[PDB]
A = this chain, B = another copy of it.
Amino acid sequence: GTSQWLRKTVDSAAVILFSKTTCPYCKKVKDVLAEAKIKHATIELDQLSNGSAIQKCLASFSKIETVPQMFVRGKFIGDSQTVLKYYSNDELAGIVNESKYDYDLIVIGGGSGGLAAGKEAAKYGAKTAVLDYVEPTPIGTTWGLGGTCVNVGCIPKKLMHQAGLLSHALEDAEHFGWSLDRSKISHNWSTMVEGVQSHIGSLNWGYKVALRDNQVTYLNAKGRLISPHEVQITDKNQKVSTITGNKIILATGERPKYPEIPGAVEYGITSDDLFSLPYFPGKTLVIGASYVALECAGFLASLGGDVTVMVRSILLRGFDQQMAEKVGDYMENHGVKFAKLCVPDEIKQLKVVDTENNKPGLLLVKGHYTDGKKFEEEFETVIFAVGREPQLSKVLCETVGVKLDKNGRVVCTDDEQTTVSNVYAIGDINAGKPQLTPVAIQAGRYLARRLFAGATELTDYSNVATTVFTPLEYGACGLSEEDAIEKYGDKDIEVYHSNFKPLEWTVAHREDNVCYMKLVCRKSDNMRVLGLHVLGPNAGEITQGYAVAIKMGATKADFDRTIGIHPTCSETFTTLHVTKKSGVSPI
Protein backbone atom coordinates (compact mmCIF):
# COMPACT_ATOMS: atom_id res chain seq x y z
CA GLY A 1 0.00 0.00 0.00
CA THR A 2 2.81 2.39 -0.85
CA SER A 3 0.74 4.12 -3.53
CA GLN A 4 -2.15 4.27 -1.05
CA TRP A 5 0.02 6.02 1.53
CA LEU A 6 1.30 8.44 -1.10
CA ARG A 7 -2.18 9.42 -2.27
CA LYS A 8 -3.36 10.00 1.29
CA THR A 9 -0.19 11.94 2.14
CA VAL A 10 -0.41 14.19 -0.91
CA ASP A 11 -4.14 14.83 -0.51
CA SER A 12 -3.96 15.91 3.15
CA ALA A 13 -0.59 17.65 3.52
CA ALA A 14 -0.81 21.44 3.36
CA VAL A 15 2.70 22.04 2.00
CA ILE A 16 5.01 19.08 1.39
CA LEU A 17 8.38 18.68 -0.29
CA PHE A 18 9.58 15.34 -1.66
CA SER A 19 13.36 15.40 -1.43
CA LYS A 20 16.57 13.45 -1.01
CA THR A 21 19.25 14.12 1.61
CA THR A 22 22.01 14.40 -1.01
CA CYS A 23 20.25 16.57 -3.60
CA PRO A 24 21.60 20.09 -4.30
CA TYR A 25 18.42 21.07 -6.16
CA CYS A 26 16.33 20.02 -3.14
CA LYS A 27 18.57 22.16 -0.92
CA LYS A 28 17.96 25.09 -3.26
CA VAL A 29 14.21 24.71 -2.70
CA LYS A 30 14.59 24.13 1.05
CA ASP A 31 16.70 27.27 1.40
CA VAL A 32 14.20 29.33 -0.58
CA LEU A 33 11.29 28.05 1.51
CA ALA A 34 13.30 28.80 4.66
CA GLU A 35 14.03 32.37 3.56
CA ALA A 36 10.39 32.86 2.60
CA LYS A 37 9.47 31.40 6.00
CA ILE A 38 7.15 28.92 4.28
CA LYS A 39 6.69 25.99 6.66
CA HIS A 40 6.33 22.54 5.12
CA ALA A 41 6.71 18.84 5.60
CA THR A 42 9.63 17.05 3.99
CA ILE A 43 9.86 13.44 2.85
CA GLU A 44 13.45 12.34 2.25
CA LEU A 45 12.93 9.53 -0.25
CA ASP A 46 16.48 8.21 0.29
CA GLN A 47 15.61 7.41 3.94
CA LEU A 48 12.58 5.28 2.99
CA SER A 49 12.87 1.62 2.00
CA ASN A 50 10.15 2.09 -0.64
CA GLY A 51 11.62 5.43 -1.76
CA SER A 52 12.24 4.27 -5.32
CA ALA A 53 8.65 3.07 -5.72
CA ILE A 54 7.30 6.31 -4.23
CA GLN A 55 9.48 8.39 -6.55
CA LYS A 56 7.96 6.60 -9.56
CA CYS A 57 4.43 6.82 -8.16
CA LEU A 58 4.79 10.62 -7.83
CA ALA A 59 4.67 10.87 -11.63
CA SER A 60 0.97 9.94 -11.48
CA PHE A 61 0.48 13.33 -9.79
CA SER A 62 3.23 15.44 -11.38
CA LYS A 63 4.22 13.68 -14.66
CA ILE A 64 7.84 13.52 -13.38
CA GLU A 65 9.88 11.16 -11.22
CA THR A 66 12.66 13.57 -10.18
CA VAL A 67 13.23 15.35 -6.87
CA PRO A 68 12.48 17.88 -5.53
CA GLN A 69 8.70 17.89 -6.01
CA MET A 70 6.58 20.42 -4.12
CA PHE A 71 2.85 19.98 -3.45
CA VAL A 72 0.32 22.38 -1.94
CA ARG A 73 -2.98 20.93 -0.70
CA GLY A 74 -2.81 18.06 -3.17
CA LYS A 75 -1.66 20.12 -6.17
CA PHE A 76 1.74 19.57 -7.72
CA ILE A 77 3.45 22.98 -7.77
CA GLY A 78 6.71 22.24 -9.55
CA ASP A 79 10.29 21.04 -9.61
CA SER A 80 13.19 23.22 -8.48
CA GLN A 81 13.24 25.55 -11.50
CA THR A 82 9.49 26.14 -11.23
CA VAL A 83 9.40 26.80 -7.47
CA LEU A 84 12.40 29.11 -7.75
CA LYS A 85 10.81 31.00 -10.65
CA TYR A 86 7.63 31.47 -8.61
CA TYR A 87 9.70 32.78 -5.70
CA SER A 88 11.66 35.20 -7.88
CA ASN A 89 8.35 36.43 -9.34
CA ASP A 90 6.97 37.03 -5.81
CA GLU A 91 4.22 34.54 -6.71
CA LEU A 92 5.14 31.66 -4.39
CA ALA A 93 3.54 33.26 -1.31
CA GLY A 94 0.15 33.38 -3.02
CA ILE A 95 0.36 29.80 -4.26
CA VAL A 96 1.19 28.31 -0.86
CA ASN A 97 -1.76 30.18 0.71
CA GLU A 98 -4.36 29.03 -1.85
CA SER A 99 -7.04 26.87 -0.22
CA LYS A 100 -10.71 25.93 -0.58
CA TYR A 101 -11.07 26.53 3.16
CA ASP A 102 -10.07 29.30 5.56
CA TYR A 103 -7.87 26.82 7.45
CA ASP A 104 -6.20 23.48 6.86
CA LEU A 105 -7.08 22.60 10.46
CA ILE A 106 -9.60 23.91 12.95
CA VAL A 107 -9.06 22.68 16.50
CA ILE A 108 -12.18 23.06 18.64
CA GLY A 109 -10.80 23.28 22.16
CA GLY A 110 -7.66 24.89 23.51
CA GLY A 111 -6.63 22.42 26.17
CA SER A 112 -3.96 19.76 26.54
CA GLY A 113 -4.74 17.87 23.34
CA GLY A 114 -5.95 20.74 21.19
CA LEU A 115 -3.03 23.08 21.79
CA ALA A 116 -0.60 20.20 21.25
CA ALA A 117 -2.28 19.21 17.98
CA GLY A 118 -2.52 22.76 16.67
CA LYS A 119 1.08 23.69 17.41
CA GLU A 120 2.37 20.49 15.82
CA ALA A 121 0.26 20.90 12.68
CA ALA A 122 1.47 24.45 12.10
CA LYS A 123 5.05 23.15 12.15
CA TYR A 124 4.28 21.47 8.79
CA GLY A 125 2.63 24.47 7.18
CA ALA A 126 -1.00 23.72 8.03
CA LYS A 127 -2.90 26.99 8.38
CA THR A 128 -4.36 26.36 11.81
CA ALA A 129 -7.01 27.91 14.05
CA VAL A 130 -7.40 26.98 17.72
CA LEU A 131 -10.76 27.84 19.29
CA ASP A 132 -11.07 27.97 23.07
CA TYR A 133 -13.91 29.12 25.28
CA VAL A 134 -14.45 28.45 28.97
CA GLU A 135 -18.11 28.26 29.89
CA PRO A 136 -18.34 29.80 33.39
CA THR A 137 -19.19 27.65 36.41
CA PRO A 138 -22.53 28.22 38.19
CA ILE A 139 -20.92 30.82 40.49
CA GLY A 140 -19.22 32.58 37.55
CA THR A 141 -15.71 31.13 37.66
CA THR A 142 -13.74 31.30 34.42
CA TRP A 143 -10.06 31.16 33.42
CA GLY A 144 -7.65 31.55 30.50
CA LEU A 145 -6.24 29.46 27.68
CA GLY A 146 -4.74 26.03 28.32
CA GLY A 147 -7.58 23.71 29.32
CA THR A 148 -8.46 21.68 32.39
CA CYS A 149 -5.01 20.49 33.49
CA VAL A 150 -3.43 23.95 33.30
CA ASN A 151 -6.24 25.92 34.95
CA VAL A 152 -8.33 23.66 37.19
CA GLY A 153 -6.65 20.25 37.09
CA CYS A 154 -3.20 18.61 37.30
CA ILE A 155 -1.20 21.81 37.67
CA PRO A 156 -3.03 23.66 40.50
CA LYS A 157 -3.92 20.36 42.13
CA LYS A 158 -0.31 19.18 42.34
CA LEU A 159 0.79 22.61 43.53
CA MET A 160 -1.69 22.48 46.41
CA HIS A 161 -0.58 18.89 47.06
CA GLN A 162 2.96 20.22 47.38
CA ALA A 163 1.73 22.87 49.83
CA GLY A 164 0.29 19.99 51.81
CA LEU A 165 3.42 17.85 51.63
CA LEU A 166 5.41 20.79 53.00
CA SER A 167 3.40 20.40 56.21
CA HIS A 168 5.17 17.08 56.77
CA ALA A 169 8.46 18.60 55.67
CA LEU A 170 8.10 21.18 58.48
CA GLU A 171 7.41 18.44 61.02
CA ASP A 172 10.33 16.37 59.77
CA ALA A 173 12.79 19.27 59.78
CA GLU A 174 12.72 19.38 63.58
CA HIS A 175 13.88 15.78 63.91
CA PHE A 176 16.65 16.45 61.40
CA GLY A 177 17.92 19.26 63.63
CA TRP A 178 16.22 22.46 62.46
CA SER A 179 15.03 24.83 65.18
CA LEU A 180 11.48 25.43 63.95
CA ASP A 181 8.39 24.58 66.01
CA ARG A 182 5.76 23.19 63.63
CA SER A 183 2.95 23.68 66.16
CA LYS A 184 3.36 27.47 65.89
CA ILE A 185 3.25 27.54 62.06
CA SER A 186 -0.03 28.03 60.20
CA HIS A 187 -1.10 28.12 56.56
CA ASN A 188 -2.64 31.03 54.64
CA TRP A 189 -4.98 29.88 51.85
CA SER A 190 -5.04 33.25 50.08
CA THR A 191 -1.24 33.41 49.85
CA MET A 192 -1.12 29.96 48.30
CA VAL A 193 -3.93 30.63 45.82
CA GLU A 194 -2.25 33.86 44.74
CA GLY A 195 0.96 31.95 44.01
CA VAL A 196 -0.82 29.12 42.17
CA GLN A 197 -2.87 31.59 40.14
CA SER A 198 0.20 33.66 39.24
CA HIS A 199 1.81 30.54 37.74
CA ILE A 200 -1.41 29.61 35.89
CA GLY A 201 -1.50 33.14 34.48
CA SER A 202 2.03 32.75 33.16
CA LEU A 203 0.85 29.59 31.41
CA ASN A 204 -2.26 31.29 29.97
CA TRP A 205 -0.09 34.11 28.61
CA GLY A 206 2.64 31.75 27.39
CA TYR A 207 0.15 29.76 25.29
CA LYS A 208 -1.19 32.90 23.64
CA VAL A 209 2.38 34.04 22.90
CA ALA A 210 3.42 30.65 21.53
CA LEU A 211 0.42 30.42 19.19
CA ARG A 212 1.13 33.91 17.86
CA ASP A 213 4.81 33.09 17.38
CA ASN A 214 3.89 29.85 15.60
CA GLN A 215 1.43 31.67 13.29
CA VAL A 216 -1.55 29.80 14.80
CA THR A 217 -4.79 31.79 14.92
CA TYR A 218 -6.23 31.82 18.44
CA LEU A 219 -9.94 32.58 18.70
CA ASN A 220 -11.46 32.97 22.16
CA ALA A 221 -14.81 31.80 20.86
CA LYS A 222 -17.17 28.88 21.25
CA GLY A 223 -17.08 26.64 18.20
CA ARG A 224 -19.94 24.54 16.88
CA LEU A 225 -19.42 22.15 13.99
CA ILE A 226 -22.51 22.66 11.80
CA SER A 227 -21.27 20.65 8.79
CA PRO A 228 -18.13 18.56 8.12
CA HIS A 229 -16.10 21.63 7.10
CA GLU A 230 -17.96 24.57 8.70
CA VAL A 231 -17.46 25.75 12.27
CA GLN A 232 -19.84 28.36 13.63
CA ILE A 233 -18.04 30.56 16.18
CA THR A 234 -19.56 32.80 18.86
CA ASP A 235 -17.21 35.33 20.41
CA LYS A 236 -17.52 37.05 23.78
CA ASN A 237 -19.59 39.84 22.20
CA GLN A 238 -22.07 37.15 21.02
CA LYS A 239 -21.16 37.88 17.38
CA VAL A 240 -21.79 34.76 15.28
CA SER A 241 -19.85 33.83 12.15
CA THR A 242 -18.65 30.80 10.17
CA ILE A 243 -15.11 29.66 9.40
CA THR A 244 -14.24 26.68 7.24
CA GLY A 245 -11.48 24.13 7.66
CA ASN A 246 -10.26 21.08 5.79
CA LYS A 247 -9.52 18.93 8.85
CA ILE A 248 -11.34 19.36 12.17
CA ILE A 249 -10.03 18.17 15.53
CA LEU A 250 -12.57 18.00 18.36
CA ALA A 251 -10.70 18.50 21.62
CA THR A 252 -13.39 19.98 23.87
CA GLY A 253 -12.75 17.97 27.05
CA GLU A 254 -15.14 17.53 29.96
CA ARG A 255 -16.51 19.45 32.96
CA PRO A 256 -17.53 18.30 36.45
CA LYS A 257 -20.88 16.61 37.01
CA TYR A 258 -23.37 17.80 39.52
CA PRO A 259 -25.91 15.41 41.04
CA GLU A 260 -29.56 16.27 40.42
CA ILE A 261 -30.44 17.27 43.98
CA PRO A 262 -31.75 20.52 45.41
CA GLY A 263 -29.03 22.97 46.34
CA ALA A 264 -26.16 21.25 44.54
CA VAL A 265 -25.66 23.77 41.74
CA GLU A 266 -26.64 26.75 43.91
CA TYR A 267 -24.57 26.08 47.04
CA GLY A 268 -21.85 23.51 46.24
CA ILE A 269 -18.68 24.00 44.23
CA THR A 270 -16.44 21.75 42.15
CA SER A 271 -12.74 21.53 41.41
CA ASP A 272 -13.39 24.17 38.73
CA ASP A 273 -13.98 26.68 41.54
CA LEU A 274 -11.64 25.36 44.20
CA PHE A 275 -8.29 26.31 42.71
CA SER A 276 -9.09 30.06 42.60
CA LEU A 277 -11.44 30.16 45.58
CA PRO A 278 -11.20 33.61 47.24
CA TYR A 279 -11.84 32.19 50.73
CA PHE A 280 -10.57 29.14 52.58
CA PRO A 281 -13.16 26.36 52.28
CA GLY A 282 -13.16 25.79 56.03
CA LYS A 283 -14.99 22.70 57.25
CA THR A 284 -15.37 20.89 53.94
CA LEU A 285 -17.43 17.96 52.68
CA VAL A 286 -16.07 16.35 49.52
CA ILE A 287 -18.78 14.29 47.82
CA GLY A 288 -17.21 11.59 45.68
CA ALA A 289 -14.41 9.08 45.80
CA SER A 290 -12.53 9.64 42.53
CA TYR A 291 -8.87 10.52 42.41
CA VAL A 292 -9.99 14.17 42.17
CA ALA A 293 -12.05 13.86 45.34
CA LEU A 294 -9.31 12.14 47.35
CA GLU A 295 -6.54 14.43 46.05
CA CYS A 296 -8.48 17.55 47.04
CA ALA A 297 -9.56 16.14 50.39
CA GLY A 298 -5.97 15.17 51.10
CA PHE A 299 -4.35 18.54 50.58
CA LEU A 300 -7.22 20.38 52.28
CA ALA A 301 -6.64 18.29 55.38
CA SER A 302 -2.86 18.80 55.29
CA LEU A 303 -3.45 22.55 55.08
CA GLY A 304 -5.38 22.42 58.37
CA GLY A 305 -8.92 21.83 57.13
CA ASP A 306 -11.63 19.77 58.81
CA VAL A 307 -12.39 17.45 55.89
CA THR A 308 -14.99 14.71 55.31
CA VAL A 309 -15.34 12.57 52.17
CA MET A 310 -18.79 11.15 51.39
CA VAL A 311 -18.39 7.77 49.64
CA ARG A 312 -21.31 6.18 47.78
CA SER A 313 -19.66 2.73 47.60
CA ILE A 314 -15.90 2.31 47.10
CA LEU A 315 -12.76 4.42 46.74
CA LEU A 316 -11.06 4.85 43.37
CA ARG A 317 -13.41 2.64 41.37
CA GLY A 318 -11.50 1.15 38.45
CA PHE A 319 -8.21 1.14 40.38
CA ASP A 320 -6.69 -1.80 42.26
CA GLN A 321 -8.87 -2.01 45.33
CA GLN A 322 -6.20 -3.27 47.70
CA MET A 323 -4.24 -0.13 46.85
CA ALA A 324 -7.31 2.11 47.05
CA GLU A 325 -8.01 0.81 50.55
CA LYS A 326 -4.42 1.51 51.65
CA VAL A 327 -4.71 5.01 50.18
CA GLY A 328 -7.86 5.69 52.20
CA ASP A 329 -6.52 4.07 55.37
CA TYR A 330 -3.56 6.46 55.23
CA MET A 331 -5.88 9.44 54.69
CA GLU A 332 -8.13 8.38 57.56
CA ASN A 333 -5.17 7.96 59.89
CA HIS A 334 -3.98 11.46 58.91
CA GLY A 335 -7.11 13.42 59.63
CA VAL A 336 -9.55 12.79 56.78
CA LYS A 337 -12.98 11.59 57.85
CA PHE A 338 -15.10 9.33 55.65
CA ALA A 339 -18.89 9.04 55.49
CA LYS A 340 -19.21 5.56 54.04
CA LEU A 341 -22.02 4.02 51.98
CA CYS A 342 -23.58 7.46 51.86
CA VAL A 343 -25.16 9.76 49.27
CA PRO A 344 -26.44 13.35 49.46
CA ASP A 345 -30.13 14.25 49.20
CA GLU A 346 -30.08 18.06 49.38
CA ILE A 347 -27.88 21.00 50.29
CA LYS A 348 -29.57 23.81 52.24
CA GLN A 349 -28.01 27.23 52.70
CA LEU A 350 -27.57 28.52 56.26
CA LYS A 351 -25.23 31.46 55.54
CA VAL A 352 -24.52 33.20 52.24
CA VAL A 353 -20.87 33.46 51.17
CA ASP A 354 -19.44 36.76 52.47
CA THR A 355 -17.84 38.34 49.40
CA GLU A 356 -16.37 41.19 51.52
CA ASN A 357 -14.28 38.69 53.47
CA ASN A 358 -12.26 35.53 53.11
CA LYS A 359 -15.01 33.53 54.79
CA PRO A 360 -17.14 30.70 53.44
CA GLY A 361 -20.85 30.50 54.09
CA LEU A 362 -22.54 27.66 55.93
CA LEU A 363 -24.49 24.73 54.54
CA LEU A 364 -26.66 21.93 55.85
CA VAL A 365 -26.08 18.62 54.04
CA LYS A 366 -28.82 15.99 54.29
CA GLY A 367 -28.21 12.52 52.94
CA HIS A 368 -28.74 8.86 53.69
CA TYR A 369 -26.83 5.61 54.02
CA THR A 370 -27.63 2.55 51.94
CA ASP A 371 -29.51 1.05 54.90
CA GLY A 372 -31.83 4.09 54.87
CA LYS A 373 -30.48 5.89 57.93
CA LYS A 374 -30.13 9.66 57.69
CA PHE A 375 -27.03 11.78 57.29
CA GLU A 376 -27.30 15.38 58.49
CA GLU A 377 -24.34 17.66 59.20
CA GLU A 378 -23.26 21.27 58.71
CA PHE A 379 -20.33 22.21 56.50
CA GLU A 380 -18.89 25.50 55.35
CA THR A 381 -18.02 24.20 51.85
CA VAL A 382 -19.39 21.26 49.84
CA ILE A 383 -17.24 20.12 46.89
CA PHE A 384 -18.83 17.80 44.30
CA ALA A 385 -16.21 15.48 42.79
CA VAL A 386 -18.53 12.77 41.43
CA GLY A 387 -17.11 12.53 37.91
CA ARG A 388 -16.75 14.55 34.73
CA GLU A 389 -18.72 14.46 31.48
CA PRO A 390 -18.40 15.71 27.89
CA GLN A 391 -20.41 18.70 26.71
CA LEU A 392 -20.74 17.96 23.02
CA SER A 393 -24.39 18.40 22.07
CA LYS A 394 -23.52 22.08 22.64
CA VAL A 395 -20.72 21.55 20.09
CA LEU A 396 -22.18 19.01 17.62
CA CYS A 397 -25.33 19.47 15.61
CA GLU A 398 -26.59 15.90 15.28
CA THR A 399 -26.94 16.84 11.59
CA VAL A 400 -23.22 16.41 11.01
CA GLY A 401 -23.09 12.65 11.59
CA VAL A 402 -20.37 12.32 14.26
CA LYS A 403 -21.29 9.22 16.24
CA LEU A 404 -21.36 9.45 20.04
CA ASP A 405 -21.63 6.64 22.56
CA LYS A 406 -24.19 6.29 25.36
CA ASN A 407 -22.00 8.54 27.55
CA GLY A 408 -21.77 11.36 25.00
CA ARG A 409 -18.17 10.59 23.99
CA VAL A 410 -16.94 10.41 20.39
CA VAL A 411 -16.57 6.99 18.78
CA CYS A 412 -13.22 6.89 16.99
CA THR A 413 -11.09 4.48 15.05
CA ASP A 414 -7.54 3.80 16.24
CA ASP A 415 -6.30 6.83 14.27
CA GLU A 416 -8.74 9.19 16.10
CA GLN A 417 -11.03 9.52 13.06
CA THR A 418 -14.73 10.03 13.76
CA THR A 419 -17.56 8.75 11.56
CA VAL A 420 -17.03 11.90 9.45
CA SER A 421 -13.92 11.35 7.40
CA ASN A 422 -12.22 14.76 7.96
CA VAL A 423 -13.19 15.11 11.64
CA TYR A 424 -11.07 13.66 14.42
CA ALA A 425 -11.31 13.64 18.19
CA ILE A 426 -8.60 13.61 20.86
CA GLY A 427 -8.33 13.79 24.61
CA ASP A 428 -11.00 13.10 27.19
CA ILE A 429 -13.90 13.08 24.70
CA ASN A 430 -12.42 10.19 22.70
CA ALA A 431 -14.44 7.21 23.92
CA GLY A 432 -12.65 4.40 25.71
CA LYS A 433 -9.24 6.11 26.07
CA PRO A 434 -7.41 6.92 29.31
CA GLN A 435 -8.36 10.46 30.26
CA LEU A 436 -4.94 11.91 31.00
CA THR A 437 -3.10 15.03 29.85
CA PRO A 438 -0.04 13.21 28.35
CA VAL A 439 -2.33 10.87 26.42
CA ALA A 440 -4.14 13.84 24.88
CA ILE A 441 -0.82 15.53 24.03
CA GLN A 442 0.62 12.41 22.41
CA ALA A 443 -2.60 11.69 20.50
CA GLY A 444 -2.77 15.27 19.24
CA ARG A 445 0.86 15.54 18.22
CA TYR A 446 0.89 12.14 16.52
CA LEU A 447 -2.38 12.83 14.69
CA ALA A 448 -1.05 16.16 13.41
CA ARG A 449 1.97 14.39 11.95
CA ARG A 450 -0.23 11.82 10.19
CA LEU A 451 -2.46 14.55 8.75
CA PHE A 452 0.20 16.94 7.58
CA ALA A 453 3.57 15.16 7.47
CA GLY A 454 2.76 11.73 6.04
CA ALA A 455 3.46 9.95 9.32
CA THR A 456 1.86 6.59 10.04
CA GLU A 457 2.57 6.06 13.73
CA LEU A 458 -0.46 5.61 15.96
CA THR A 459 -0.84 6.40 19.63
CA ASP A 460 -0.50 3.35 21.88
CA TYR A 461 -3.14 3.61 24.61
CA SER A 462 -2.18 0.41 26.49
CA ASN A 463 -0.45 0.23 29.89
CA VAL A 464 -0.58 3.98 30.41
CA ALA A 465 0.83 4.68 33.88
CA THR A 466 -1.04 6.80 36.42
CA THR A 467 -0.32 8.52 39.71
CA VAL A 468 -2.91 9.61 42.25
CA PHE A 469 -1.49 12.54 44.23
CA THR A 470 -3.08 11.69 47.52
CA PRO A 471 -1.13 12.58 50.70
CA LEU A 472 0.66 9.27 50.32
CA GLU A 473 0.90 8.97 46.54
CA TYR A 474 -0.20 5.92 44.52
CA GLY A 475 1.48 5.08 41.21
CA ALA A 476 0.43 2.25 38.92
CA CYS A 477 1.11 0.86 35.49
CA GLY A 478 -0.87 -1.99 33.98
CA LEU A 479 -3.47 -4.26 35.46
CA SER A 480 -4.95 -4.26 38.90
CA GLU A 481 -4.54 -7.53 40.71
CA GLU A 482 -8.28 -8.28 40.49
CA ASP A 483 -8.39 -7.59 36.74
CA ALA A 484 -5.40 -9.87 36.21
CA ILE A 485 -7.05 -12.67 38.17
CA GLU A 486 -10.32 -12.19 36.26
CA LYS A 487 -8.56 -12.34 32.89
CA TYR A 488 -6.16 -15.24 33.50
CA GLY A 489 -7.38 -17.07 36.62
CA ASP A 490 -5.93 -17.06 40.11
CA LYS A 491 -3.69 -20.06 39.46
CA ASP A 492 -1.89 -18.22 36.64
CA ILE A 493 -1.24 -15.06 38.71
CA GLU A 494 1.69 -14.62 41.05
CA VAL A 495 1.93 -11.43 43.12
CA TYR A 496 5.22 -10.36 44.66
CA HIS A 497 4.92 -7.66 47.29
CA SER A 498 6.61 -5.85 50.15
CA ASN A 499 6.11 -3.01 52.56
CA PHE A 500 8.94 -0.51 52.76
CA LYS A 501 10.02 2.52 54.79
CA PRO A 502 11.59 5.53 53.07
CA LEU A 503 14.93 6.22 54.70
CA GLU A 504 13.69 9.80 55.03
CA TRP A 505 10.96 8.52 57.36
CA THR A 506 13.37 6.90 59.86
CA VAL A 507 14.81 9.92 61.68
CA ALA A 508 11.42 11.58 61.15
CA HIS A 509 9.57 8.88 63.17
CA ARG A 510 7.02 8.09 60.45
CA GLU A 511 5.26 4.77 59.89
CA ASP A 512 7.19 1.59 59.18
CA ASN A 513 4.68 -0.54 57.19
CA VAL A 514 2.46 1.86 55.28
CA CYS A 515 4.38 2.25 52.03
CA TYR A 516 3.73 -0.77 49.84
CA MET A 517 4.55 -2.11 46.41
CA LYS A 518 3.61 -5.16 44.40
CA LEU A 519 4.14 -6.77 41.01
CA VAL A 520 1.21 -8.70 39.53
CA CYS A 521 2.70 -11.34 37.24
CA ARG A 522 1.55 -14.06 34.85
CA LYS A 523 3.14 -17.45 35.52
CA SER A 524 2.39 -19.05 32.13
CA ASP A 525 4.01 -16.11 30.28
CA ASN A 526 7.47 -16.25 31.90
CA MET A 527 6.25 -14.24 34.92
CA ARG A 528 5.38 -11.27 32.71
CA VAL A 529 4.71 -8.14 34.79
CA LEU A 530 1.02 -7.40 34.16
CA GLY A 531 0.78 -4.62 36.70
CA LEU A 532 3.03 -2.57 38.94
CA HIS A 533 1.70 -0.72 42.00
CA VAL A 534 3.44 1.52 44.54
CA LEU A 535 2.11 3.50 47.50
CA GLY A 536 4.74 5.92 48.75
CA PRO A 537 6.43 9.29 48.36
CA ASN A 538 7.30 10.48 44.89
CA ALA A 539 5.22 7.64 43.43
CA GLY A 540 5.04 9.28 40.01
CA GLU A 541 8.81 9.55 39.76
CA ILE A 542 9.11 5.95 40.92
CA THR A 543 6.57 4.58 38.48
CA GLN A 544 7.43 6.42 35.28
CA GLY A 545 10.59 4.57 34.31
CA TYR A 546 9.03 1.15 34.83
CA ALA A 547 6.28 2.03 32.32
CA VAL A 548 8.93 1.84 29.59
CA ALA A 549 10.01 -1.61 30.78
CA ILE A 550 6.40 -2.81 30.97
CA LYS A 551 5.76 -1.38 27.50
CA MET A 552 8.68 -3.57 26.38
CA GLY A 553 7.21 -6.66 28.08
CA ALA A 554 9.28 -6.79 31.25
CA THR A 555 9.23 -10.01 33.27
CA LYS A 556 9.94 -10.57 36.93
CA ALA A 557 13.38 -11.80 35.82
CA ASP A 558 14.02 -8.42 34.17
CA PHE A 559 13.35 -6.68 37.50
CA ASP A 560 15.50 -9.17 39.42
CA ARG A 561 18.54 -8.94 37.15
CA THR A 562 18.50 -5.16 37.44
CA ILE A 563 20.56 -3.68 40.28
CA GLY A 564 18.97 -1.24 42.70
CA ILE A 565 19.99 2.36 43.37
CA HIS A 566 20.65 2.78 47.08
CA PRO A 567 19.18 4.37 49.16
CA THR A 568 15.88 4.82 47.29
CA CYS A 569 12.29 3.75 47.61
CA SER A 570 12.24 2.51 44.03
CA GLU A 571 15.04 -0.05 44.46
CA THR A 572 12.72 -2.33 46.45
CA PHE A 573 11.17 -3.30 43.11
CA THR A 574 14.47 -5.05 42.23
CA THR A 575 14.53 -7.48 45.16
CA LEU A 576 10.89 -8.52 45.65
CA HIS A 577 10.59 -12.13 46.70
CA VAL A 578 7.58 -12.59 49.03
CA THR A 579 4.61 -13.99 47.11
CA LYS A 580 1.01 -13.59 48.19
CA LYS A 581 0.56 -17.33 47.65
CA SER A 582 3.24 -18.05 50.26
CA GLY A 583 1.23 -16.36 53.03
CA VAL A 584 4.40 -14.74 54.44
CA SER A 585 3.80 -11.31 55.90
CA PRO A 586 5.03 -8.42 53.68
CA ILE A 587 6.24 -6.34 56.66
Q: Hey, which bits of chain A sit against chain B, CB under 8 A? A: 149, 154-155, 158-159, 162-163, 166-167, 169-170, 172-173, 175-180, 185-192, 195-196, 198-199, 303, 434, 436-439, 441-442, 460, 464-467, 475, 503-504, 506-507, 538, 540-549, 551-552, 554, 558-559, 561-571, 573-575
Contacts and interface: CB of A to CB of B under 8 A. Distances in A.
Given A158-B503, A542-B544, A177 B187 contact: yes
A434 B547 CA distance: 26
Contacts of A196: 507
11 contacts: A154-B566, A162-B507, A166-B169, A178-B187, A198-B507, A199-B507, A436-B566, A441-B575, A540-B567, A544-B568, A547-B565
Given A169-B169, A173-B166, A177-B191, A565 B465 contact: yes
A467 B565 contact: yes
A434 B487 CA distance: 42
Nearest to A569: B541
Contacts of A162: 176, 503-504, 507
B563 A442 contact: yes
Contacts of A549: 545-546, 548-549, 552, 554
A563 B547 contact: yes
Contacts of A167: 178
Given A170-B173, A438-B571, A563-B547, A185 B195 contact: no
Contacts of A542: 541, 544-545
Kindly name the residue among A303, A466, A567, A569 whose own CB sees the greatest number of chain B CB atoms within 10 A.
Answer: A567
A446 to B, nearest CB: 10
B565 A540 contact: yes
Given A561-B460, A570-B540, A570-B545, A178 B186 contact: yes
B566 A562 contact: no
Contact of A543 (B180, B189, B545, B552): B545
Contact of A163 (B176, B437, B475, B569): B176
A112 to B, nearest CB: 9
Kindly name the residue among A177, A437, A441 whose own CB sees the greatest number of chain B CB atoms within 10 A.
Answer: A177
B541 A568 contact: yes
Contacts of A541: 538, 541-542, 568-570
Nearest to A149: B566
Nearest to A507: B195
How many copies the complex holds: the figure is: 2
Given A199-B507, A558-B552, A562-B548, A438 B574 contact: yes
A30 to B, nearest CB: 15
Contacts of A467: 565, 568
Contacts of A547: 545, 562-563, 565
A570 B548 contact: no
Contacts of A569: 541
Contact of A177 (B188, B434, B442, B540): B188
B179 A187 contact: yes
A575 B442 CA distance: 9
Contact of A563 (B170, B172, B439): B439
B543 A551 contact: no
A542 B565 CA distance: 10
Contact of A158 (B173, B442, B567): B567
A438 to B, nearest CB: 4
A548 B556 CA distance: 10
A439 B562 CA distance: 10
Given A177-B189, A185-B179, A187-B178, A437 B540 contact: no
A198 B176 CA distance: 12
Contacts of A439: 563
A545 B552 CA distance: 13
A177 B194 CA distance: 9
A544 B558 contact: no
A545 B532 CA distance: 11
Nearest to A542: B541
B159 A177 contact: no
A437 B169 CA distance: 28
A565 B543 contact: yes
Kindly name the residue among A438, A442, A475, A546 whose own CB sees the greatest number of chain B CB atoms within 10 A.
Answer: A438
A499 to B, nearest CB: 16
Contacts of A172: 166
Nearest to A506: B199
A554 B553 CA distance: 11
B551 A561 contact: yes
A551 B559 CA distance: 9
A363 B511 CA distance: 43
Contacts of A564: 438, 544
A187 B177 CA distance: 5
B166 A178 contact: yes
A548 B558 contact: yes
A79 to B, nearest CB: 28
A172 B564 CA distance: 30
Kindly name the residue among A172, A303, A504, A561 whose own CB sees the greatest number of chain B CB atoms within 10 A.
Answer: A561
